[PDB]
Design a protein around this nucleic acid. Sequence first.
RNA 1: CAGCGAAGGAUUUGGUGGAUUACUAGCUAAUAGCAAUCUA
Lengths: 793, 820, 39, 213, 125
Amino acid sequence: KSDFKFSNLLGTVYRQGNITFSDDGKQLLSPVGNRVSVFDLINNKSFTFEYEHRKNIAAIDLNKQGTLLISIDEDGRAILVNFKARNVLHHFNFKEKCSAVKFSPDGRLFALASGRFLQIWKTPDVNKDRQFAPFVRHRVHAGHFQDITSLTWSQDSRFILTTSKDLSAKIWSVDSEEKNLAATTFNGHRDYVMGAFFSHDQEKIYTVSKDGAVFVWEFTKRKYSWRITKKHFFYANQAKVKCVTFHPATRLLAVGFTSGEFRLYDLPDFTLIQQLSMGQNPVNTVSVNQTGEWLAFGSSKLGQLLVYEWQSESYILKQQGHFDSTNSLAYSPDGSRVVTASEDGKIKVWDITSGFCLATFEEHTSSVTAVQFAKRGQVMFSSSLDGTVRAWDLIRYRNFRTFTGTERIQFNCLAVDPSGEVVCAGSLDNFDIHVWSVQTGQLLDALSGHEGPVSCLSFSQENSVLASASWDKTIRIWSIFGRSQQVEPIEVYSDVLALSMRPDGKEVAVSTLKGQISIFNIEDAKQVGNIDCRKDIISGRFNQDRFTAKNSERSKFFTTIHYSFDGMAIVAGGNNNSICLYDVPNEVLLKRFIVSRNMALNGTLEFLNSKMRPEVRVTSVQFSPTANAFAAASTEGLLIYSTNDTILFDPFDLDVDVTPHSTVEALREKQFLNALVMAFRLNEEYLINKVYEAIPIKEIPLVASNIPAIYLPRILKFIGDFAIESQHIEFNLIWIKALLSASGGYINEHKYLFSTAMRSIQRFIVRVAKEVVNTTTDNKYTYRFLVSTDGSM
Amino acid sequence: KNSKIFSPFRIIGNVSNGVPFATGTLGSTFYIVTCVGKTFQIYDANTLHLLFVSEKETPSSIVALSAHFHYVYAAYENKVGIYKRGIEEHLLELETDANVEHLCIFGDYLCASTDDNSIFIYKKSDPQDKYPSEFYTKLTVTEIQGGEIVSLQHLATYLNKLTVVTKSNVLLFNVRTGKLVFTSNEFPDQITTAEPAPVLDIIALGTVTGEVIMFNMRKGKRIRTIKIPQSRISSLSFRTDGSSHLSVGTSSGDLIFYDLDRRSRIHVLKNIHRESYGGVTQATFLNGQPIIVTSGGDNSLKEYVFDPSLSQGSGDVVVQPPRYLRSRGGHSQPPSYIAFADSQSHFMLSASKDRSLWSFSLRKDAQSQEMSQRLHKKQDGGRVGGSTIKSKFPEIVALAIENARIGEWENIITAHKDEKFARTWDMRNKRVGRWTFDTTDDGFVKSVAMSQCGNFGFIGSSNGSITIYNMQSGILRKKYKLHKRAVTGISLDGMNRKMVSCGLDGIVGFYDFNKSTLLGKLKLDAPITAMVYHRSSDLFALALDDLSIVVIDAVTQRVVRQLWGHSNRITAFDFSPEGRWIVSASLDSTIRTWDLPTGGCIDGIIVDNVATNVKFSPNGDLLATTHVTGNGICIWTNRAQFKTVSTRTIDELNDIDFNTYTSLEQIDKELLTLSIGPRSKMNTLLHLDVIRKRSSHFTKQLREGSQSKDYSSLLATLINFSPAAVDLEIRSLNSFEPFDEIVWFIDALTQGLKSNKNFELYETFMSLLFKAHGDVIHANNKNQDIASALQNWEDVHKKEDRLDDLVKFCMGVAAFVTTA
Amino acid sequence: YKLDVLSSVHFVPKTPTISMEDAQPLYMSNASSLAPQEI
Amino acid sequence: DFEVVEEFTPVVLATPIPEEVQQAQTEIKLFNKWSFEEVEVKDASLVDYVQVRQPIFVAHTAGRYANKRFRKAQCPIIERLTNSLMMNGRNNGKKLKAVRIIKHTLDIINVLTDQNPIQVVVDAITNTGPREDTTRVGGGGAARRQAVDVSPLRRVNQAIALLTIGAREAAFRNIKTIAETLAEELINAAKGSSTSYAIKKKDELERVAKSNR
Amino acid sequence: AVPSVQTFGKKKSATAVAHVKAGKGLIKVNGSPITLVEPEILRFKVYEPLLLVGLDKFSNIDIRVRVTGGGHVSQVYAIRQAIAKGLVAYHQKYVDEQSKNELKKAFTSYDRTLLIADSRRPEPK
RNA sequence: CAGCGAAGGAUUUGGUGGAUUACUAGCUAAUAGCAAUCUA
């Protein structure tokens, strides 16, 4: 239950730093703020590393074995991570701002540009155990006079070519015996040298500067001593070079400027292969694939990330995120994608597994305040500060409906019908609730009776009663449908922000400004029970303010709460860097999550070092409708916390004779039901999978009819989280058919237990199985046409 | 015994052990290299930060260590190791079996004295290299010439000579010619220390009766004598900043300061270190500086500074006494209890037999701080009792930290040796708290716990009664009386709903906590000594008296595992943070790891000291053990955080031993099965034209499969290559005169989807065929070969409606069951 | 932009062939996403 | 065995509190006399409409029960009896007089039938409420009645109404008062004696429904 | 100098100010004890803040209530509201928060009108 | 007054030291030198 771990970070495909590819360039590693995201672009998936720098990261490299990563932040706190185990190996503090870090091509050394010293360390093994000091220093060279801007290793890991703000570039041999081969310095640029590369044969050296000159250096005679043979110029007048890279094998120089324009050249002849623009913001990063076919560009101001193949002129992806400006989120009615309403005025529909945005919608001319799904993922409603609620078909991607009032107000929250006839929206300057029909477009009603700004709205999903709650310290329940026009006001102790509604519509949980979460019975309007949450809230100290984090009244309350789908838990977040979840029977804190440890954000540290910034805040929390997770719209992105059953041995009434050995003996002796319930009492995912695949098709329905009723949600949620990605489609559908036929009355009379295990199953039937069935159906009908009709002339 | 889960990382909390440290000087800064057992540690003397720790543990204890500029020379059992930045550069094996026990380094020479009164000289090869490396000669101090060698020094401007300080004599060797230049007259008492003065050719000798001699090593006389009666002299140091002071260090822990110019005694720092642990073991002035670094055997390293004089004209006669400056320290006695302060594995609380509670940092050793015992004020306003001569609290039996409400109120609850109340502490302030919870039955505190709401603390007395206090306000809330003998374990649920107590009468009581009922009581077969509650999985483990570990869950109150194998009393145990393993340690000098899923012993370590405490980190990072000897905390890292270990039992289905199940490729040949690959490949193939608008071997294998009537290699190549390659191979298939390549592709897809594997890909390959050149198939429809190939493709493909009505049933009934 | 950035609490940030069209919706490989009534 | 200590000093206050008042902190009884546990509703379909599961100290809960439809199904049935007792033009508003005569009638119910008077009044409700009734199917005014069933809230409503107005007319000009006539009415309705106005009226309504069923 | 706490209890036009401080255990309404609060049939309406939570909460504190306005039943409802939320506020400020929200849970399970009145009315239908 | 109460108790304040981010040493013209010195 409560054992959530940080899974993913949706939104924000790039923040600051350098993009890296893999060696077999399938994944790309992107520095999001202090995490690192890794997007696998072929197997369409994505993860974010769990570890966390304390400032924004500025350098990334992983060796070409793929086996370990090193990430340096913007004051030199390096972190060495095991890339396969996903666990951090060492924390090493270089003392000043490191501009670049690079592993050697042979993997065994890495070097980095810390200030004006090039320092080469040698890589610790991944097979060795963790030591107190795993890095052993090779050397530290100081020949530059100002800060080094770039490294480049040679093809053999033998020379290293560094570029500085000082107007030179230098070549250093790795070992001392080749010191005479590499002792030259390369002058002649008017500005900062942005890059210095070898050719494929390491005979020519190209040095690209900030003003726009690329110099070709050759070991010629005018003795032989590294002349400059040709200077080529970009002649981009106002713009200047922001990032350079070179693929030496395909002779491809890729250059991004401070105007969004990037050009890519075939270098020793200097012929413009292509020139095109990311946008208007500067191109902060260029990176290239190992085969040189993909170019990943990152612009840091809008947080955007291209990877673009330059042969077939086409963008593998275009993915722009939102730093700090995200007002709301909503899970799709199957937990496959999250819709994000963001303050720059747009809707963005992010896939969860593959961490990318599918569609974006810009028809609001101001900050979109709320999104909400309806009609089972077919329609999606959003309300913004420009005065409009509007509806979005997620099939034809059209804004088909726009609802305004008559009073020119700005809407801050909405709520739709279950049977989506009516949308409803509340403002923070009008004290009314606006009730629109969705079929026609008209303003059906204006509900009046709050004496304070309507902070939150929610329709009960079962009996369709409206619950609004406002800053006049009052939650209010409106019976709209069918001749009632009934109003029931429940007073509460302080002013309310974030009401939420149970999945059965029985109760409503409100968050108040005191710091509490009160839970009320709707039909008999009396309080069922409250949680006192203002003492398990982490409220950090800002830098500008002159009052301690203990005595602050800034963020000791929750501005967004949400029920779990079994109705038993509440996740909650606010303008603080803790999100807390509770179980509402016992009113006790299950777990508290620190949403950021970035010291670049403001409200993170409670105690500031006695030796504006974007504050950290969560603006919306939601539980996943299909699989045991929650998304939180922080300032860093959409933090996705999820459990997984691979770890955490948590049995269910095992005894001493219940053992993996006992389970495989029962499987080998083919008591299949006993093996299945032994694996359920182990609650071990590999054992459940092993027994599940070992049961034959002949006796799926006998086992599925004899499964005990306490192990029913376990086998249903297992079949869901297995069958989304497993290939055994007919096996999984046979099991689903046998379970629904044998025990599908228990499910119907215990709806909210199997409310997230059944939504995960019909995330498998309509999303892989129905697509396959559509393909075979179209093949059958094209066959019947192509052989049944007359093609003659 | 080497392990396969945990590997040794460091032993934290150690600063010194009373080997005389060495000082070294890089440029104008100073470092201080102190021995901690078998490693040394380099400290930055301007701030006492831990720069370096030696990379490997030496095979025995380091016994004499010196430091020139970049290099540190550490002598242990037989040999001298030359270390730079911790990493060992060289190892000088001596040709003896005698233990090397002194050394000096001057010039190209390293001179190492053994304990059989032989001296080994080692020489550099060429005077430009970094350390003395080659053997040169051997010197011997026989019984005629002098006693046991008590020090080995080189006083300056002495061209390749060596002052050897024996117990009665002072010899002077020429170490190039191997000669004994000068042997002094005898000394009437045994001399223990020596230090060269910054005066030219003067050494200072310290005797076992109380006198400092100032021997002039060129005249052969003694210049002056300083008498400190009944004090054995253990250190000598000289001030070198224009103030001629000497600092002697006395093995009753005293540091006495003398003016040599005006022959007075400046000041005495009394009890600067403990006499019982050796007194002041090494004291030295950082040269040119008024700061002196002392170190003692009580695991402590201090600095004292001389402020400038307070009289603006006299100065030299009004010498302000030395004051204290920074210091590092740890426990002076081996720790008795261990806990982790937080889930981040950053701080760990640690209580010792020297009656101190330290908070040690696993990230940076400067952050280690002693929790203060300065009591608060009484709540009403009455007087607090106790002695006026303040001493530390009795040594800590148990403790329990739960930082849910940290900074808010009292946070740690701790139980001391043979006293009837449990103190509280605040980890945020790092100090004691306002409350001492009584037991209310005149019994000593045998266990403590506290809930994870942070509101409640639980005291378990030796007369069998649990008392539940409030941590905020410090008052009795409830009191359960089930046991009659001593309650050794209390814990509570993560939801404050069921508590579990275990006493040494061998009954585990299960109580409801909100209601004050008991849910049950289970009688085991031995007295229970210790409980550990794994709180997420609700499984608690008991160390019984019959040397078993009973793992029992609190939900259904059954013994669910029973782990046998320990040969003596189980000292400690702890759960893995995921709750899969349990690591125990017992008085047969062993540490075992048990995989309680399978119920067997994964790994065992025979460790020479008995491990008295074992704690996992609250993440899966580290194991922390605590042994009988050694003032620190031994730290291990689990290698199973980076690899996966086999849960296969030691003594003295490889996927099921490695907890995996690689899902088999297809379960039955009559079952449809998708590809082992991404699900999106079907959609990419079916719509890659509009996707991009929004953004040969094949022919030879096809022909050879048409010969052999087996297209398995063709279909393997098709399932292998990429969507652009698939479209570009299907789009070029010779659709013109006899139509062979089309019909070979069609009955290849027939042979493919007869096999019920990759069938969504075979379906999209047929869709791509009909899309690319289904117009030529429609054109020469009624052609015999292509019509028969499509006929048998439909013959196999018409058995695909099993999937259709299967997903129709699942969709319709799932919708009906969910909605209605 | 500038009047509502100073009238607020929380922080608000601010020829070749193509500007790559980084922001673009409608795409789960949809081509004819029009309505049948629209057609 | 096992015992919990949860007070650690005998509680004494500076204001002296009566011994039965400080005995009332272990169980809530109506008027500190009549226990609410082991008071069951011996007829199902009326449990969840006669409410005896939140015990009270006096029949004067000033809560608001007339602003949703079935919210008066969880007013405690002693207070519903009290509120129905304070109705006519003479005795409107006088809830303290109604509470005082409810206290007197429960005292004399217990002194006549030595059993729990809350159990007696709950049995009187569940025996009085009619289980069938007739509506007048109109046809423009064709005088024909059709038997309908009757919902449990209407059964509890009409039960309290029949009992209270039977006590009024039984106390109309006899020597007995409203408290004594209501006691006789609740006792006879509890045992179901057919000597009460209330269950004679129930038997007439049910018999007419049986007639023109 | 003393830890003290002031709360308010209101019904229609009665209003009651309750001062709670540490003491010996005396509960006094309008100077007279709590066992004199007429109309004597609603004395248990006044008592139920004491009997719902036990007199061991009141064994260490002394309350005084000053009640003006209203009528008989409005004054007993003001008294019980003032006593209840005064005990809650005292255990908030000077005793632990766990006993604070245990008291809030007990009073709210009995009736939350001990803690929150029904104040602004009517409804214009 | 009672009570609390070990060769005393309370309040206030100045200075210094250690933490307030996760520990790979100083200098320079830096593949090494110096640190007693870079200069003939």
